[PDB]
Amino acid sequence: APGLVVGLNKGKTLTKRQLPERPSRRKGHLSKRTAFVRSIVREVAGFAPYERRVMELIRNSQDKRARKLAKKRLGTLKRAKGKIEELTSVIQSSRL
Amino acid sequence: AIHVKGQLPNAHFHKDWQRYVKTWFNQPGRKLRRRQARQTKAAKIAPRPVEAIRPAVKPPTIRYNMKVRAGRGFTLEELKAAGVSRRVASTIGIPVDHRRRNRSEESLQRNVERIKVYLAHLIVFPRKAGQPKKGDATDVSGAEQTDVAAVLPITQEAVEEAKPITEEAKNFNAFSTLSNERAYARYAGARAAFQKKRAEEA
Amino acid sequence: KKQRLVAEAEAVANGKSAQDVSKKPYNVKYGLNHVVALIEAKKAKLVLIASDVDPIELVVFLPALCKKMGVPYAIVKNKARLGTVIHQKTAAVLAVTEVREEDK
Amino acid sequence: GAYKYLEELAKKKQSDVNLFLSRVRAWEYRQMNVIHRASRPSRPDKARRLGYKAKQGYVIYRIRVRRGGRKRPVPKGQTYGKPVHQGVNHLKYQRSARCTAEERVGRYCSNLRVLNSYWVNQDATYKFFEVILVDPSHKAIRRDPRINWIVNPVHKHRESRGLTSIGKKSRGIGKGHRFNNSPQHATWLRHNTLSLRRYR
Amino acid sequence: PSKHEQKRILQLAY
Amino acid sequence: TKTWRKWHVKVNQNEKRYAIASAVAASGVPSLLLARGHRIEEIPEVPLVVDD
RNA sequence: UUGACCUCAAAUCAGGUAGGACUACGCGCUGAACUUAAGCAUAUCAAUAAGCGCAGGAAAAGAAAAUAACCAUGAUUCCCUCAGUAACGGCGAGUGAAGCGGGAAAAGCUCAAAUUUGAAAUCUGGCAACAUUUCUUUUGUUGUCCGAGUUGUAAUUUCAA
RNA sequence: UUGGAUAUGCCAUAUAAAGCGCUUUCGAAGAGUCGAGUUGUUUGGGAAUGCAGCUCUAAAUGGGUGGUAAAUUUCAUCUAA
Secondary structure, eight states, X not given: OTTSSSSSSOXXXXXXOOOXXXXXXXXXXXXXXXXXXXXXXXXXXXXXXXXXXXXXHHHTTOHHHHHHHHHHHHSSHXXXXXXXXXXXXXXXXXXX | OOOSXXXXXXXXXXXXXXXXXXXXXXXHHHHHHHHHHHHHHHHHHTTSOSSOOOOEEOOSSTTTTTSOEEOSOBOHXXXXXXXOOHHXXXXXXXXXXXSOOOSXXXXXXXXXXXXXXXXXXXXXXXXXXXXXXXXXXXXXXXXXXXXXXXXXXXXXXXXXXXXXXXXXXXXXXXXXXXXXXXXXXXXXXXXXXXXXXXXXXX | OHHHHHHHHHHHHTTOOHHHHSOOOOOOEESHHHHHHHHHTTOOSEEEEETTOSSTHHHHTHHHHHHHTTOOEEEEXXXXXXXXXXXXXXXXXXXXXXXXXXXX | OHHHHHHHHHHOTTSHHHHHHHHHHHHHHHHSOXXXXXXXXXXXXXXXXXXXOSSTTEEEEEEEEEOSOOOOOOGGGOOOSOXXXXXXXXXXXXXXXXXXXXXXXXXXXTTSEEEEEEEEEEOSSEEEEEEEEEOTTOXXXXXXXXXXXXXSGGGTTTTTTTOSHHHHHHTTOOSSGGGTTOSHHHHHHHHHOEEEOSOO | OOXXXXXXXXXXXX | OOXXXXXXXXXXXXXXXXXXXXXXXXXXXXXXXXXXXXOOTTOSOSSOOOOO
16 A cells, blocks of 8 residues: 555655654644633633533533534534533532 | 537626737737847846846655745744844845745755855855855855856656566566555545444444 | 833943843732732732712622632722822723732 | 733623622713713723833724614615515624624724724623724824834724724635635635736 | 843943 | 628748748749849859858 | 923924826726617626726735545646636526646745843944945944833744644 | 945943753733624625624634535634734
């Protein structure tokens, strides 16, 4: 397959290199300062009404309909699940 | 109407096209204008070459990857290997392409040698006449405006000449390998699904 | 500042160290961003937040930021009064970092 | 830095704090004129991002624009022609209300160049925007190498010609296959010009 | 000490 | 009348070279020259070659 | 009672600026019908004409939230080619791009997000000097007062880091 | 009348400013915006190509795009407002 056009690892075999990391690909990494500021803003502002609804539903352990509510609010399951872990982490911290 | 031998007509001429017809009567006039501007630029920027040095890259497709063409500029990694500072390169006329990167030592060595030849054949005038500093020519009397194409062209890889036929080549089935590897790639996903499903069942 | 700056100039012209000519300043720290950095670095020992900042969001986060870093903070009236302290018209916040041993 | 805290607060738009501030401020902005000057930016962090500096020659105007779609100004809603062109109510305008905000503020201050603008508030009837404006005739602007570009005459009414950020978006200015048809006239004129060369 | 003030006292001396 | 009439007509380069070669060969033939109209009745030689 | 600040006014206040015309080319907005479909309503005409706003000697676009699936390419623009192609269509009449490749030309960068904090280091204006000139018509430098500015002007950094 | 060199004189406080070198390090990156649904309009863009209205509205290795809808998992690529 290597050096064969067809196959699984198709293509010419060359002396591979280690590409230096791109600074533009570091984006999305949570900084210490960004994490600290967002914690302060969370503690000052609070939660959105739908975030309260999802939190209450998860507390009642109706997770499936909590996920459905989050998806209907945000718009995607990817974002809906991401909010689910965020609010799940919040409630566990509150109970502890 | 349609009653004659030949193709069915397809003339996209139902808009007001006569307003937007484009004629080419200025084709020699445009050609002469480009040359005069080209000659003006060469006289304005002399002695340095009219066209900057470009790297040698490979086009990105199975249809063209066997050819070597000219790129936009030398990558940061290539300049660092050649010993040219990123800031200095743009001053002495070495284009720098931040977007490109060297995935193979073959391409890196190709352009590194390309820069090294350019540096060896380069004459850099001192900023102040009479005091050469680091990279700087002591004698600049013989400077002339030449062409980078004459000094250093983009050369395609030479077609391999005759080589002996080995026994390991003799006992090699080209068509069977092609069909086997195509089927191997085609059912790679199904095999992995079978193996994982069997594993969880076990 | 101008007289002190000039006096340093003749001192340098006279051939003297710039460090020993002028003493270390001891003054109130002002400006919203500068005070915020001091609180995050725990260098501010006292923070005075104006009660009538408009827009209010410029200082809404400040009591929480002061509380987390344990910086003593008070909400004082009249950003105009804070401005008069720092020779300006209005000041969002004032921060005291270092004071002399007489006023400790 | 307080601008990080302001940015994150502006992100939390459903918080009780921002809801209260939105209600009080939207009431106040509705009591004032439709195009009234803002003494200072209400979102100083947002203004700085877009290009505002707190110095002479920078001006900020608040404006409210009515919400909803575009209804044809045809008399009595009567169109003339094929039914495909007969709709009058559910039509929409091709520029954002933010673009309309800059147009009206730019026309209001005809001696200023529209730098940029930003949403500040909304309700059922209006959306409130703040438009950042630069004075090309001010020496603080003309001696500033960072903002000299707007002094050149090619930048007269960037908002009117769709050269702002929201203006480029409304024209569909972008890179790639998703923005192929734009600029519309330049692209269309290229594809509909009949190139008849000499030796053909 | 302040390097920018050092440039400024030099400027005033000049 | 329109300007996008075809004013220039394309000719194969090889045919142009064929016609140049034919025209040069004809210039070497004295009888064609007299037909063409040139008063060469007392020209010393055809083709006429002169010093540098 | 004086003041401070915020906000809002007034002046034939000091100094400026906007309008209108031209509109071949340029950026938008708005927007048809004749016509083709041998009728006709989707379609087409056409993202056209008319209407409206706004620029320059070009404008726009432009240093990737870009292609690709390669041995990978590398801002934009234009030309040839892709290509009357993929696709769209009462899948009817009709419509219809893009990647690569070749060329013309090539040039890169600037902010917001950082404590100068051992010193707002920044800037407009008045006044007074000097100076300079496509120019007694232009353009400034220096000094000094008022002011703007800490709700942030300089230096510093821009992801290629 | 201009242009770029030169040939010089003078003012230039380089205490400074900058490029490169390796860092067990940290590394701030644009929000009624992306995105989702829907309705108009557009495109060659076809379970939506762009744009706009309205409703809902994130995130932090996150978010775009990889031209057949959806869920999950990888891989490239780019770094928007």
